[PDB]
Design a protein around this ligand. Structure first.
Ligand SMILES: [Mg+2]
Ligand SMILES: [Mg+2]
Ligand SMILES: [Mg+2]
Ligand SMILES: [Mg+2]
Ligand SMILES: [Mg+2]
Ligand SMILES: [Mg+2]
Ligand SMILES: [Mg+2]
Ligand SMILES: [Mg+2]
Ligand SMILES: [Mg+2]
Ligand SMILES: [Mg+2]
Ligand SMILES: [Mg+2]
Ligand SMILES: [Mg+2]
Ligand SMILES: [Mg+2]
Ligand SMILES: [Mg+2]
Ligand SMILES: [Mg+2]
Ligand SMILES: [Mg+2]
Ligand SMILES: [Mg+2]
Ligand SMILES: [Mg+2]
Ligand SMILES: [Mg+2]
Ligand SMILES: [Mg+2]
Ligand SMILES: [Mg+2]
Ligand SMILES: [Mg+2]
Ligand SMILES: [Mg+2]
Ligand SMILES: [Mg+2]
Ligand SMILES: [Mg+2]
Ligand SMILES: [Mg+2]
Ligand SMILES: [Mg+2]
Ligand SMILES: [Mg+2]
Ligand SMILES: [Mg+2]
Ligand SMILES: [Mg+2]
Ligand SMILES: [Mg+2]
Ligand SMILES: [Mg+2]
Ligand SMILES: [Mg+2]
Ligand SMILES: [Mg+2]
Ligand SMILES: [Mg+2]
Ligand SMILES: [Mg+2]
Ligand SMILES: [Mg+2]
Ligand SMILES: [Mg+2]
Ligand SMILES: [Mg+2]
Ligand SMILES: [Mg+2]
Ligand SMILES: [Mg+2]
Ligand SMILES: [Mg+2]
Ligand SMILES: [Mg+2]
Ligand SMILES: [Mg+2]
Ligand SMILES: [Mg+2]
Ligand SMILES: [Mg+2]
Ligand SMILES: [Mg+2]
Ligand SMILES: [Mg+2]
Ligand SMILES: [Mg+2]
Ligand SMILES: [Mg+2]
Ligand SMILES: [Mg+2]
Ligand SMILES: [Mg+2]
Ligand SMILES: [Mg+2]
Ligand SMILES: [Mg+2]
Ligand SMILES: [Mg+2]
Ligand SMILES: [Mg+2]
Ligand SMILES: [Mg+2]
Ligand SMILES: [Mg+2]
Ligand SMILES: [Mg+2]
Ligand SMILES: [Mg+2]
Ligand SMILES: [Mg+2]
Ligand SMILES: [Mg+2]
Ligand SMILES: [Mg+2]
Ligand SMILES: [Mg+2]
Ligand SMILES: [Mg+2]
Ligand SMILES: [Mg+2]
Ligand SMILES: [Mg+2]
Ligand SMILES: [Mg+2]
Ligand SMILES: [Mg+2]
Ligand SMILES: [Mg+2]
Ligand SMILES: [Mg+2]
Ligand SMILES: [Mg+2]
Ligand SMILES: [Mg+2]
Ligand SMILES: [Mg+2]
Ligand SMILES: [Mg+2]
Ligand SMILES: [Mg+2]
Ligand SMILES: [Mg+2]
Ligand SMILES: [Mg+2]
Ligand SMILES: [Mg+2]
Ligand SMILES: [Mg+2]
Ligand SMILES: [Mg+2]
Ligand SMILES: [Mg+2]
Ligand SMILES: [Mg+2]
Ligand SMILES: [Mg+2]
Ligand SMILES: [Mg+2]
Ligand SMILES: [Mg+2]
Ligand SMILES: [Mg+2]
Ligand SMILES: [Mg+2]
Ligand SMILES: [Mg+2]
Ligand SMILES: [Mg+2]
Ligand SMILES: [Mg+2]
Ligand SMILES: [Mg+2]
Ligand SMILES: [Mg+2]
Ligand SMILES: [Mg+2]
Ligand SMILES: [Mg+2]
Ligand SMILES: [Mg+2]
Ligand SMILES: [Mg+2]
Ligand SMILES: [Mg+2]
Ligand SMILES: [Mg+2]
Ligand SMILES: [Mg+2]
Ligand SMILES: [Mg+2]
Ligand SMILES: [Mg+2]
Ligand SMILES: [Mg+2]
Ligand SMILES: [Mg+2]
Ligand SMILES: [Mg+2]
Ligand SMILES: [Mg+2]
Ligand SMILES: [Mg+2]
Ligand SMILES: [Mg+2]
Ligand SMILES: [Mg+2]
Ligand SMILES: [Mg+2]
Ligand SMILES: [Mg+2]
Ligand SMILES: [Mg+2]
Ligand SMILES: [Mg+2]
Ligand SMILES: [Mg+2]
Ligand SMILES: [Mg+2]
Ligand SMILES: [Mg+2]
Ligand SMILES: [Mg+2]
Ligand SMILES: [Mg+2]
Ligand SMILES: [Mg+2]
Ligand SMILES: [Mg+2]
Ligand SMILES: [Mg+2]
Ligand SMILES: [Mg+2]
Ligand SMILES: [Mg+2]
Ligand SMILES: [Mg+2]
Ligand SMILES: [Mg+2]
Ligand SMILES: [Mg+2]
Ligand SMILES: [Mg+2]
Ligand SMILES: [Mg+2]
Ligand SMILES: [Mg+2]
Ligand SMILES: [Mg+2]
Ligand SMILES: [Mg+2]
Ligand SMILES: [Mg+2]
Ligand SMILES: [Mg+2]
Ligand SMILES: [Mg+2]
Ligand SMILES: [Mg+2]
Ligand SMILES: [Mg+2]
Ligand SMILES: [Mg+2]
Ligand SMILES: [Mg+2]
Ligand SMILES: [Mg+2]
Ligand SMILES: [Mg+2]
Ligand SMILES: [Mg+2]
Ligand SMILES: [Mg+2]
Ligand SMILES: [Mg+2]
Ligand SMILES: [Mg+2]
Ligand SMILES: [Mg+2]
Ligand SMILES: [Mg+2]
Ligand SMILES: [Mg+2]
Ligand SMILES: [Mg+2]
Ligand SMILES: [Mg+2]
Ligand SMILES: [Mg+2]
Ligand SMILES: [Mg+2]
Ligand SMILES: [Mg+2]
Ligand SMILES: [Mg+2]
Ligand SMILES: [Mg+2]
Ligand SMILES: [Mg+2]
Ligand SMILES: [Mg+2]
Ligand SMILES: [Mg+2]
Ligand SMILES: [Mg+2]
Ligand SMILES: [Mg+2]
Ligand SMILES: [Mg+2]
Ligand SMILES: [Mg+2]
Ligand SMILES: [Mg+2]
Ligand SMILES: [Mg+2]
Ligand SMILES: [Mg+2]
Ligand SMILES: [Mg+2]
Ligand SMILES: [Mg+2]
Ligand SMILES: [Mg+2]
Ligand SMILES: [Mg+2]
Ligand SMILES: [Mg+2]
Ligand SMILES: [Mg+2]
Ligand SMILES: [Mg+2]
Lengths: 117, 146, 63, 202
RNA sequence: CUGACUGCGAGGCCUGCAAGCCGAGCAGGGGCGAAAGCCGGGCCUAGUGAACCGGUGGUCCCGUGUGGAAGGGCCAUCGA
RNA sequence: GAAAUUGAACUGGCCGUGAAGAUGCGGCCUACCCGUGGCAGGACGAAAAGACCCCGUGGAGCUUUACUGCAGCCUGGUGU
RNA sequence: GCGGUAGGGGAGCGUUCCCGAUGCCGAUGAAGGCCGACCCGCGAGGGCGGCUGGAGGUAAGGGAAGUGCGAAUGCCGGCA
RNA sequence: AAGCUGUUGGGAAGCAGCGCCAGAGAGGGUGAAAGCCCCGUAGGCGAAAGGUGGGGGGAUAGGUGAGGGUACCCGAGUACCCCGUGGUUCGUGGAGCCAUGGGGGAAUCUGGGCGGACCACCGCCUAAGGCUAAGUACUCCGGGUGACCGAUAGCGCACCAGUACCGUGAGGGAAAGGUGAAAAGAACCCCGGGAGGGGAGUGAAAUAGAGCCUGAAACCGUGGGCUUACAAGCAGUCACGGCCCCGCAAGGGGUUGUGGCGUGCCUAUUGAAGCAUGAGCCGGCGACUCACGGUCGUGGGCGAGCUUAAGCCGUUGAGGC
RNA sequence: GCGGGGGGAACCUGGGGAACUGAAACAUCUCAGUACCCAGAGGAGAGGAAAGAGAAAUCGACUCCCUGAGUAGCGGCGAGC
């Protein structure tokens, strides 16, 4: 019993090519270049899925430090006081209160200040 | 019952290892990976190194043979009387070759441990111990002659 | 097709009733000149092997 | 198992026979496999790089050619050229142990008997080798086509009459084998055929 | 005076293999000593070579229809 | 209306880095998008699975007081 | 407890072909093709929906291999 | 051998209805899926002529007996021995037997060879003349059958192939199958020198228009949505934003502006992003098999036993001896 | 007057007769009387009525298959046969 390659090799190829669309040049038309670029893309995606955390942490931290420096202290003093006050509150992100409702942010500044020392 | 599932009772799996793929036995395919993995290794059974084999041993096994070679001679087949004790009456090489223990080795010769039955027995030879154990039970004639 | 036995092997090696392989003690034919009587007795006997022992079996087996 | 129904022109009396109760499906698997693998016939063929019809000359020097590096065109890397490990003619049949065969056979008849579908007969009104007669007689035996039937008897005429029928398969007593037993849902056969069946094993 | 013995060898050292090395003790028969005992070569570590092949002596063996003989095996020793 | 060539290209300089000889890495500098006509410094530019060198218990040609053979010639006996 | 090359082990996916087939599916449209942001599986993959196409296809459960390609300055063809 | 009606369709063999034959429910064709439409199938029947024909029947050629006595005959440069070799499992080996190029060279049954040097004994056989079917091998040819191929496969050749073409020559050696049920192969009009098209017409379909079924990928074009001319890039990825689009909703698809990050794939390597190797791109072919014999494991049958090989019987996917 | 001549895919017999390769070099050996050249044969060919086998006072022309048997043996007693 013989079995040619048949549909198979095309189907598989087509599948990979389906992801390739959007890419520049042969890299999206040719199966081979498509495969390679898809590999690199997969790895980049996996890595940046961890990068996203660091990036957002940093952005938040900058904003927090800015609005905190509006009141008189720096981010280091802020977190020292806040963690010393007992408020394990606010996954740093939720200090977005710098933007909306900055009054709450100010009361938090005080509660950190007095409990700092 | 019908051809829907006489299927082999879940152990015989013909799953021969197909090594050509991208996962399982990729690229190098089967245990190879190096070189002199191509046509075929030299033996290895008895052979190789190119030194001296284990061939340093020696033939004490004399009488390996002459040109006319094998000298035909009456080959003696032994038989314990404990396997003979399975049945009883009066045995001859015919009965022993019929039972299963003889296989036309022809020259019969009872011997050995086990226990003796008082029955009679024709053979071609008799071991001492067997002759005595059977002497304490029954009678026994010697060979024909040839 | 149909493995021929290794004639060299059988002419110089005996397979045990259990499974081991037996050969004669080497060093008792050419090296003698005034070697002690201790030698020629201990070299007169036969002995086992080890892992080439397992190789040997393959070289027979119709035997 | 034992209490099988026997049909004859004088009533529906019964009978009994050995027929082991326990039935290993795997045994039927190996026997049927042996049968289908022996009825198999090797024939698939191909040609090696030497079984080809080409020349042997090295197609080009390989040195300084700039091209690849090749030998004769019979090589399997070439299109048209020899196949690599193509199938050659070979025998698929082997020797399944007789004990196993008679075993599986008696076990198949046994299972069919256990289901109750078995039926030993002697009444054959459909004398002449004609389909309609066997159709009426089958209408008598409760046969109808609802169940595929294996018929086994030494009678040539009955064989002929039942032969064309699609929901039935002809068979001689010596032709009795596990595959055909498994095929049909219901088994019907002669007293003589069942006698020689008992002669093989019983 | 000739234990530079014959028939062995429990148990190890070293070691991939093969090989090398140490050895109490048992039986036979002897050496020296009154005996206890010591002796299976030399204070010890190099002084050497698997196997195949052949020479010589020896012996419970095999020896092609049977008896011999040729030849072979085994034990001893020899040809790097 | 061709050709060798061609992994893909959105293909800059310096300084360093690194398999030490980077358009692709880091740092700094420079640069509007596309072409035409010219030069030949770089892309270790193209070309030939290095002709130098080494390796393979590879091949071939040649040599001789390497080995073993063969032709050819010399030679004793014998048949004619 | 779970980085992983050589390597060993386990569990699966798909292709062709046979039993299951005097069967079942198919003009109310088979195989193949094109499309998808939908469904299921960790994955190979299976399923559904629209379009094309026009005569074949093959369950559950088993069986057998010319059985899965990205590279060999691979082979043939097509086209830059 | 045994079929009509209704129905859907371009076309029925599909569908529905009742019905029929079967020693035929193999298969092929018929516009689509037919036991009953055609060709066949099961089962039967047939030769004036040619071939074959011990299977049977006849005929001929031919062959068939015991004891006594006689010394006539019984295969020649042969036996046998030696020299040089071949054959056999036998490579000179204790090397026989058979075969014979060279040399010596008999006997005719009280003879002669041989049974592994040679000898004795015990046995087998008649050399140096010839003939013979069957059982066995093969496949140019015919037929059957495939858990064999389906146009890069399968014979090199499904087709005007050992051709075209290459080579002085021996030789080398290809590609190339597909309208549709039916040609009904597109009249006539139109543009055009034609080629080629646009109507019209045939057809179920012309996206079946003639190297014409299905029409994949590279590659080349046209229109559209998004986007770019101060920007440094293995061309991606994550994030937010704008424009465009499907959707009540929330959401989702496409694109890419800015920002973060980012040294192609395989191979060979102590080590690669390497200025080490291989690939222009796409599609198809392409590489761990089978046979016998082992070895462990493994699912079963049997068990001091287990199993048959060639073959014969059976059948024509039936097994048994 | 009778016969011969040439051809035939493979098979068959006979007369000649290699090397790569194997031995992990190589010369005895191996591949092997295989490839091939030549002659001849016929639907087959060869072989065939014992101057035999070889241990049983046994078999009773030849060919082919299974087994004997990878035994007996052969062998730089190596490869291997
Ligand atoms: Mg393939
Ligand atoms: Mg994009
Ligand atoms: Mg954080
Ligand atoms: Mg792995
Ligand atoms: Mg790869
Ligand atoms: Mg290496
Ligand atoms: Mg090998
Ligand atoms: Mg020896
Ligand atoms: Mg004797
Ligand atoms: Mg016994
Ligand atoms: Mg020593
Ligand atoms: Mg000593
Ligand atoms: Mg001794
Ligand atoms: Mg010892
Ligand atoms: Mg060949
Ligand atoms: Mg060839
Ligand atoms: Mg050719
Ligand atoms: Mg060649
Ligand atoms: Mg090139
Ligand atoms: Mg009838
Ligand atoms: Mg029948
Ligand atoms: Mg001694
Ligand atoms: Mg010492
Ligand atoms: Mg001692
Ligand atoms: Mg004294
Ligand atoms: Mg003492
Ligand atoms: Mg001592
Ligand atoms: Mg000294
Ligand atoms: Mg001293
Ligand atoms: Mg040494
Ligand atoms: Mg010696
Ligand atoms: Mg000697
Ligand atoms: Mg003497
Ligand atoms: Mg003697
Ligand atoms: Mg003798
Ligand atoms: Mg000698
Ligand atoms: Mg001797
Ligand atoms: Mg490169
Ligand atoms: Mg850009
Ligand atoms: Mg500087
Ligand atoms: Mg620099
Ligand atoms: Mg630099
Ligand atoms: Mg970096
Ligand atoms: Mg840079
Ligand atoms: Mg370079
Ligand atoms: Mg340059
Ligand atoms: Mg080259
Ligand atoms: Mg090179
Ligand atoms: Mg080179
Ligand atoms: Mg050159
Ligand atoms: Mg090298
Ligand atoms: Mg060199
Ligand atoms: Mg060398
Ligand atoms: Mg070397
Ligand atoms: Mg060399
Ligand atoms: Mg070579
Ligand atoms: Mg050389
Ligand atoms: Mg040269
Ligand atoms: Mg040479
Ligand atoms: Mg020269
Ligand atoms: Mg020569
Ligand atoms: Mg001359
Ligand atoms: Mg002369
Ligand atoms: Mg002369
Ligand atoms: Mg781990
Ligand atoms: Mg892991
Ligand atoms: Mg590795
Ligand atoms: Mg197919
Ligand atoms: Mg089928
Ligand atoms: Mg079927
Ligand atoms: Mg329609
Ligand atoms: Mg319909
Ligand atoms: Mg429908
Ligand atoms: Mg449709
Ligand atoms: Mg349609
Ligand atoms: Mg298909
Ligand atoms: Mg399919
Ligand atoms: Mg479809
Ligand atoms: Mg799952
Ligand atoms: Mg999917
Ligand atoms: Mg899918
Ligand atoms: Mg679909
Ligand atoms: Mg059709
Ligand atoms: Mg299936
Ligand atoms: Mg590949
Ligand atoms: Mg490629
Ligand atoms: Mg190409
Ligand atoms: Mg071009
Ligand atoms: Mg009608
Ligand atoms: Mg009608
Ligand atoms: Mg209608
Ligand atoms: Mg109708
Ligand atoms: Mg039929
Ligand atoms: Mg048709
Ligand atoms: Mg069908
Ligand atoms: Mg019907
Ligand atoms: Mg007929
Ligand atoms: Mg007839
Ligand atoms: Mg007639
Ligand atoms: Mg006639
Ligand atoms: Mg006439
Ligand atoms: Mg007459
Ligand atoms: Mg007469
Ligand atoms: Mg004569
Ligand atoms: Mg003469
Ligand atoms: Mg004589
Ligand atoms: Mg000779
Ligand atoms: Mg001679
Ligand atoms: Mg010899
Ligand atoms: Mg005489
Ligand atoms: Mg005489
Ligand atoms: Mg004789
Ligand atoms: Mg003799
Ligand atoms: Mg005599
Ligand atoms: Mg003669
Ligand atoms: Mg014949
Ligand atoms: Mg045919
Ligand atoms: Mg078929
Ligand atoms: Mg074609
Ligand atoms: Mg095609
Ligand atoms: Mg093609
Ligand atoms: Mg032309
Ligand atoms: Mg030329
Ligand atoms: Mg020409
Ligand atoms: Mg070609
Ligand atoms: Mg048609
Ligand atoms: Mg027109
Ligand atoms: Mg004109
Ligand atoms: Mg249509
Ligand atoms: Mg349509
Ligand atoms: Mg035309
Ligand atoms: Mg078509
Ligand atoms: Mg088309
Ligand atoms: Mg088109
Ligand atoms: Mg297209
Ligand atoms: Mg815009
Ligand atoms: Mg500026
Ligand atoms: Mg950058
Ligand atoms: Mg706009
Ligand atoms: Mg972007
Ligand atoms: Mg912008
Ligand atoms: Mg970006
Ligand atoms: Mg290398
Ligand atoms: Mg470099
Ligand atoms: Mg280079
Ligand atoms: Mg290199
Ligand atoms: Mg490479
Ligand atoms: Mg390149
Ligand atoms: Mg490549
Ligand atoms: Mg390609
Ligand atoms: Mg393998
Ligand atoms: Mg093994
Ligand atoms: Mg083992
Ligand atoms: Mg298991
Ligand atoms: Mg069981
Ligand atoms: Mg078992
Ligand atoms: Mg058991
Ligand atoms: Mg067999
Ligand atoms: Mg066998
Ligand atoms: Mg048959
Ligand atoms: Mg029939
Ligand atoms: Mg022959
Ligand atoms: Mg070699
Ligand atoms: Mg050499
Ligand atoms: Mg050579
Ligand atoms: Mg020979
Ligand atoms: Mg003849
Ligand atoms: Mg005798
Ligand atoms: Mg006989
Ligand atoms: Mg006779
Ligand atoms: Mg030989």
């Amino acid at each position: 019993p013989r079995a040619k390659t048949g549909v198979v090799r095309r189907r598989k190829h087509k599948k990979i090519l389906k992801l390739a669309k959007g890419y520049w040049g042969l890299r999206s038309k040719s199966f081979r270049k498509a495969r390679e670029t898809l590999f690199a893309a997969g790895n980049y995606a996996y890595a940046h899925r961890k990068r996203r955390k660091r990036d957002f942490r940093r952005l938040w931290i900058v904003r927090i430090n800015a609005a905190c420096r509006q009141h008189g202290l720096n981010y280091s003093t802020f977190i020292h006081g806040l963690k010393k006050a007992g408020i394990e509150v606010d996954r740093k992100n939720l200090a977005d209160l710098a933007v909306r409702e900055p009054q709450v942010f100010a009361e938090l500044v005080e509660r950190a200040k007095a409990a700092q020392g | 019952d019908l051809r829907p599932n006489p299927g082999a009772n879940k152990r015989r799996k013909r799953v021969g290892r197909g090594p050509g793929s991208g996962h399982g036995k990729t690229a190098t395919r089967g245990h190879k990976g190096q070189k002199s993995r191509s046509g075929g290794l030299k033996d290895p059974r008895r052979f190789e190194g190119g030194r001296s084999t284990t061939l340093m041993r020696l033939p004490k096994r004399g009488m390996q043979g002459q040109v006319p070679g094998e000298i035909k001679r009456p080959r003696y087949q032994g038989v314990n009387l404990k396997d003979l004790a399975r049945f009883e009456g009066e045995v001859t090489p015919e009965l022993l070759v019929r039972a299963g223990l003889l296989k036309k080795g022809y020259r019969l010769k009872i011997l050995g441990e086990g226990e003796a039955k008082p029955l009679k027995v024709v053979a071609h030879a008799f071991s001492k111990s067997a002759l005595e154990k059977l002497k304490a039970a029954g009678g026994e004639p010697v060979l024909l002659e040839a | 097709p149909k493995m021929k036995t290794h004639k060299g092997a059988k002419k110089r090696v005996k397979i045990t009733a259990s499974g081991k392989v037996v050969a004669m003690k080497t060093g008792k034919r050419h090296l003698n000149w005034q070697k002690s009587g201790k030698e020629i007795r201990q070299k007169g006997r036969k002995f086992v092997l080890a892992k080439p022992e397992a190789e040997r079996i393959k070289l027979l087996l119709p035997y | 198992m034992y209490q099988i129904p026997v049909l004859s022109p004088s009533g529906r009396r019964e009978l009994a026979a050995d027929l082991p109760a326990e039935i290993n499906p795997h045994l039927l698997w190996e026997v049927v496999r042996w049968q289908l693998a022996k009825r198999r016939r090797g024939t698939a063929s191909t040609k090696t790089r030497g079984e080809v019809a080409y020349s042997g000359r090295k197609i080009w020097p390989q040195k300084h050619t700039g091209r690849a590096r090749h030998g004769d065109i019979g090589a399997p890397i070439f299109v048209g050229g020899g196949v690599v490990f193509g199938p050659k003619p070979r025998d698929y049949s082997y020797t399944l142990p007789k004990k196993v065969r008679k075993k599986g056979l008696a076990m198949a008849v046994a299972d069919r008997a256990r289901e109750g579908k078995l039926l030993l007969v002697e009444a054959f009104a459909g004398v002449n080798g004609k389909t309609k007669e066997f159709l009426a007689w089958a209408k008598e035996a409760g046969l109808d086509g609802s169940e595929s039937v294996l018929l086994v008897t030494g009678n040539e005429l009955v064989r002929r009459a039942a032969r064309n029928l699609p929901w039935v398969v002809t068979l001689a007593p010596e032709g009795l084998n596990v595959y055909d037993i498994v095929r049909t849902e219901r088994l019907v056969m002669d007293l003589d055929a069942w006698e020689v069946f008992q002669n093989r094993i019983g």
